Amino acid sequence: MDETGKELVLALYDYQEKSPAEVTMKKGDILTLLNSTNKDWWKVEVNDRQGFVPAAYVKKLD
């Protein structure tokens, strides 16, 4: 429920969360970067859902 700035990213692929720590994203979704210090997992928020997603599935829009 935050502001969709904080460096935005594009969802390249359709991804399904595995655990409550991940969030589901679809190709064409604009995610907000919360933490991207990890090479494999980038913490993002979709609309309201904060979770981790594969950094390989997301790309800097900034």
Features:
Spectrin alpha chain, non-erythrocytic 1, structural protein, five-stranded antiparallel β-sheet, SH3 domain, p41-bound, mainly beta, SH3 type barrels
Shape: globular
* CATH architecture annotation name: Roll
The fourth-level CATH homologous superfamily is SH3 Domains
Kindly provide the name of the CATH class: Mainly Beta
PDB class: structural protein
Keywords: SH3 domain, p41-bound, structural protein
Assembly: monomeric
Entry title: R21A Spc-SH3 bound
Produce the secondary structure layout:
Elements: E1 8-11, E2 30-35, E3 41-46, E4 49-54, E5 58-60
Antiparallel strand pairs: 1-2, 1-5, 2-3, 3-4
Describe this structure in words.
It is classed as structural protein. This protein is 0% helix and 40% strand. With 62 residues, the protein is mostly beta strands. It has a single domain (1-62), classed as SH3 type barrels (Roll), CATH 2.30.30.40. It has a five-stranded antiparallel sheet with strand order 4-3-2-1-5, with no helix packed on it. The radius of gyration is 10 Å and the shape is globular.
The gist of it:
The PDB classes it as structural protein. The chain contains no helices and 5 strands. It is mainly β and 62 residues long.
